[PDB]
């Protein structure tokens, strides 16, 4: 499939001080403005030189894994996807397309939702790896209200080993700038990109456009 969703719009890159969590970037994936119909989508690829610091905040999560590689085409690439029940980490010779995303849709006679991964990749020829364990992310808590929870990660690739880190802490101040796991013996990495989750329905009539939609999402990035 691989429908096209990108939009001509571009915005000047914002930046903020790290404040000892620097010249950290700041991106907006789904952006809304006064003109209520302005839904925009853009997930550019970013360099991966030595290491990356990742953080985000979400009301109801739409963030599922990442993709890493050098060519990002059928000509290898590490892929991660995480869902509500279990995480899966796989190394495979995937064939991606310009606008990868994870789609979900209704199932009329089974009274449940289902997720289709074929919107991300087309071919997985002669492919081996697979892993399973408890999920990295989680979207439930014993409290709901004004305060939110903040996530963070660190990736480094030294001596051939691949390693991950993560911590969870809630905020106590009003909304502002940032307050102030496994080891996989996997490849040459120089780029990566995050992938979102989108959902569709048919309740409304005469929707002469693509039905993919979701809420607003943002995240931070930095280098070592």
């Amino acid at each position, epitope marked *: 499939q691989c429908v096209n969703l990108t939009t001509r719009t571009q915005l000047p890159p914002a930046y903020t001080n790290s404040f000892t969590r620097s010249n950290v970037t700041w991106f907006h994936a789904i952006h809304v403005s006064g003109t209520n119909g302005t839904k925009r989508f853009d997930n550019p690829v970013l360099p991966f030189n030595d290491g990356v610091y990742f953080a985000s905040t979400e009301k109801s999560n739409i963030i599922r894994g990442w993709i890493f590689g050098t060519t990002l085409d059928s000509k290898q690439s590490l892929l991660i996807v995480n869902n509500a029940t279990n995480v899966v980490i796989k190394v495979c010779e995937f064939q991606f397309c310009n606008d990868p995303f994870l789609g979900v849709y*209704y199932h*009329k*006679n089974n009274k449940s939702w289902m997720e289709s991964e074929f919107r991300v990749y087309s071919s997985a020829n002669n492919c081996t790896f697979e892993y399973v364990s408890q999920p990295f992310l989680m979207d439930l808590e014993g409290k709901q209200g004004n305060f939110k929870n903040l996530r963070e990660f660190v990736f480094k690739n030294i001596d051939g080993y691949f390693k991950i880190y993560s911590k969870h802490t809630p905020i106590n101040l009003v909304r502002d700038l940032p307050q102030g796991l496994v080891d996989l013996p996997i490849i040459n990495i120089t780029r990566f990109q995050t992938l979102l989750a989108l959902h569709r329905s*048919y*309740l409304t*009539p005469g929707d002469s456009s693509s039905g993919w939609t979701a809420g607003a999402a943002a995240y931070y990035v930095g280098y070592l």
Partner: antibody
Amino acid sequence: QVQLVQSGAEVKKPGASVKVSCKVSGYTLTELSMHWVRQAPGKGLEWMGGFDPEDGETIYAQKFQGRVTMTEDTSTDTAYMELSSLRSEDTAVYYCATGSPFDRTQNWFDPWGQGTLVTV
Amino acid sequence: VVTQPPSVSAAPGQKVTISCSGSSSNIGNNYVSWYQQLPGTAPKLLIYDNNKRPSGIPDRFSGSKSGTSATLGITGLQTGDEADYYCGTWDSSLSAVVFGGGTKLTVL
């Protein structure tokens, strides 16, 4: 944007049976309901049957029940319907309609097909 | 079952009202919708939920439900477009979705 296309015209002799096929594109049949409607020349529309979101079944009109049958196949993404015991007065155009798949009990048919004609 | 006055007529630029009626169970405890039938063409939805137009082409229309009667109209009619119009809904008692007889709009 769903676009529907179906089989070309058909002819038949008295007392036989005929089948009509309707196809979809864009969306997939597993998240849409299907209905069938017929109109006699100048006599107005008439409802044949369809899928009821209230429960998982297929219910037919009280008048024609037993003379028809419906089936679906998802691999090719095409819906099928059959008609039998054709009689003297049976002749009309046949339309393939779709609508909301998960409303409690609602009726807003859209879109429709280009139409097929069956002669008896 | 339902009834509807056939073959209404009007002059261009004037108001026009179409009346569709039913019984307590036929049209009372449900919504309605209105379709138009250009000759030699499949119908095209116009109104749903008794007052809500779909996005895009549909022009401004209205509908009120006086218990078991509903009406549709347009402030001004034109010869640019004109065809048959139909009413129909889901009967709630011992019945299924039914359609009315229709009325052949006439423009001088």
